[PDB]
């Protein structure tokens, strides 16, 4: 079944691999070579998680946890029950995620649109790879990666953070958080603004984009404009994820101490470190 306007877009072409061999849809879903690849990677990964659950002895999705190898395995392979399943599942996840991005690219090409969406998605993939690949490799062990379980991966976040004291003091983490908060602020404002113009007050014609500009100028003295706000949402969200990756790739690789110490610099500058009074005196 199709949307009423969809048939005219369902033309052959745009594939990157395989010609017309996979150039078709299953219901709404486009397939393509990378749809087949996604299916293979995801199905195998899910099968292996099921295997791990069987080994673990539970069907409870709140208890299933696939752990990486013990640190002592370093960067080597580990037996299936002792981290090897985690290793193969991580390969399948990476393959599924990259195949998803390349399937989006084929979809972009069939539709004649820009490639911004799979490019943006690649930032999420890179943040994932920072935590399961780049950082564990630099640190010398797969066992520094997070486990695949609904609650155990949160415990990994907590244990990793508190290895460095209050992780709030990581300055790249601070920047990342500021982008996440600002992004959610901008998303709320953007959604509200468009809706407040399309759904004006009762008894009123639909507003125009000039009303949106005027509203934001009246309110704060500046309107970034309709093109600008979509650029800005993309920038804020991607920057949040970039600084997330940054704040972890440096932790345990070039920073080993309590993150609060990083700030001890500005305090202990020689021309004011010894001045009595204040907090640090």
């Amino acid at each position: 079944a199709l949307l009423s306007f969809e048939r005219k877009y369902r033309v052959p072409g745009g594939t990157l691999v395989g010609g017309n061999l996979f150039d078709f849809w299953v219901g709404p879903f486009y397939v393509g070579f990378f749809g087949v690849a996604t299916f293979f990677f995801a199905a195998l990964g899910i099968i292996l998680i099921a295997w791990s659950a069987v080994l673990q002895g539970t069907w409870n999705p709140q208890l299933i946890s696939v752990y990486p190898p013990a640190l002592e395995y370093g960067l080597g392979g580990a037996p299936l029950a002792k981290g090897g399943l985690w290793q193969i599942i991580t390969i399948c996840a990476t393959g599924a995620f990259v195949s998803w991005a390349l399937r989006e690219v084929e979809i972009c090409r069939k539709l004649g649109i820009g490639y911004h969406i799979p490019f943006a998605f690649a930032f999420a993939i890179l943040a994932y790879l920072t935590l399961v690949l780049f950082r564990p490799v630099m640190m010398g062990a797969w066992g520094y990666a997070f486990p695949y379980g609904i609650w155990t991966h949160l415990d990994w976040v907590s244990n990793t953070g508190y290895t460095y004291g209050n992780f709030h003091y990581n300055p790249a983490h601070m920047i990342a958080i500021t982008f996440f908060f600002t992004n959610a602020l901008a998303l709320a404002l953007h959604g509200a603004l468009v809706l407040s113009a399309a759904n004006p007050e009762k008894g009123k014609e639909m507003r125009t984009p000039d009303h949106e500009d005027t509203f934001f100028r009246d309110l704060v003295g500046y309107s970034i404009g309709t093109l600008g706000i979509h650029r800005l949402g993309l920038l804020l969200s991607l920057s949040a994820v970039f600084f997330s990756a940054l704040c972890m790739i440096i932790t345990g690789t070039i920073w080993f101490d309590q993150w609060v110490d990083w700030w001890q610099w500005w305090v202990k500058l020689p021309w004011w470190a010894n001045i009595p009074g204040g907090i640090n005196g």
């Binding site: 649109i113 709030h168 953007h190 959604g191 509200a192 468009v194 407040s196 113009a197 500046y222 907090i279």
Partner: protein, 302 residues
Amino acid sequence: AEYQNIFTQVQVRGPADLGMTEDVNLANRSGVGPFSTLLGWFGNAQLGPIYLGSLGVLSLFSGLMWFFTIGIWFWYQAGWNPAVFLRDLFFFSLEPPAPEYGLSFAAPLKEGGLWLIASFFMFVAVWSWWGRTYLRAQALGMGKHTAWAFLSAIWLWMVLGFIRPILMGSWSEAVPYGIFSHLDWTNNFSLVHGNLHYNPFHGLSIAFLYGSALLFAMHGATILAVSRFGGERELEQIADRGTAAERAALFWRWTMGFNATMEGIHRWAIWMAVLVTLTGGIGILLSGTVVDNWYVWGQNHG
């Protein structure tokens, strides 16, 4: 390299846009400001005009008084030494009254009284700004979505500084005014309440915060991807669906099996973001009033 419409290639400039009048009291609207070529590489170059008005002036005044009450406290914590002031700027903290003072307003000025005074000014500044977000929409005949979404943020701030301290019986429970101190407050809060990772409203709040970055990356990239068909002119695309809106929908229908409309994606957007602080405020309000230890509570409820 194919052009990507992240930065403008050719800026153009014309007469300042004075805006819509509708029912705006033009007596309270400033003149136009200068144009910024720097800003024009990424968005609009025009600065101003801005609306003043009684609520805005009240909000600005109370907001500066809040900022200055903290600032004078910092100058006193620094012994009025400008170098100690810059050095420890992030370490100073205007703290609420100690627990012995309860909800009393008789805490000495240096032992919590100044915190109450600052909070009074902050309370007046935020709520008059809220009235401003409502009245600026009303004066232009627009819906009230911005005011309603802002109330969600206000809700978390009210819970943290006002509602939860009252229910817990002391101002000592509130957040201090300092850069590092309010981070320490946040870490301590989770430790005291048995790990906020196990507060299901905190887990929801994170899902919506991550989901807000997910959705704005999706939506911002989608609109840029269809800006070659005029896609960012969303209101006229709602009024009169064009190939931009059709291609944007079909990208997502072909990718994940369902899709939005030009109007409806902004309902997804506003709810994704608003739910961050709606769930977050519920989760904080329950902490210590109802649930002392989220991890233990969670073990007995699942």
